[PDB]
Amino acid sequence: ALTAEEIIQYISDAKKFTPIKVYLNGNFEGITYPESFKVFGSEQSKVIFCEADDWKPFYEAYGSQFEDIEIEMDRRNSAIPLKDL
Ligand code: NA
Numbered sequence: 001a002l003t004a005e006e007i008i009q010y011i012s013d014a015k016k017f018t019p020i021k022v023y024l025n026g027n028f029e030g031i032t033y034p035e036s037f038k039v040f041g042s043e044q045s046k047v048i049f050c051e052a053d054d055w056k057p058f059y060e061a062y063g064s065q066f067e068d069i070e071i072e073m074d075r076r077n078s079a080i081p082l083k084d085l
Contacts, residue, residue: 001084002080002082002083002084006084007080010080010081011080014076017051018052018077019049019050019051019052019073019074019076020050020052020055020071021047021049021071021072022047022048022050022055022069022070022071023046023047023068023069023070023071024041024045024046024047024066024068025044025045025068026044026065026066026067026068027044027065028043028044028046028065029065031062033048034050034051034054036051036053036054037049037050037058
């Protein structure tokens with residue numbers, strides 16, 4: 001299906017990004033989220049899909065209003081497509 005050339009081009013393009021997924025409990029009032037953030041959840045518990053490079057300074061800034069945290073690297077960091085799209 002995909003050629004070796006197409007695969008390494010894909011890896012070259014994709015590897016720049018480091019999507020992660022963060023589970024949080026806490027208070028989310030008075031927070032502005034970076035552009036890479038896609039925030040799901042309820043008033044006092046979130047799941048955030050975001051870029052690692054944005055997560056780091058965000059946590060340093062706002063981490064005092066979070067009470068529990070779990071961080072996962074998104075599986076797309078190690079995915080190659082089976083076909084093009
Ligand atoms: Na990556």
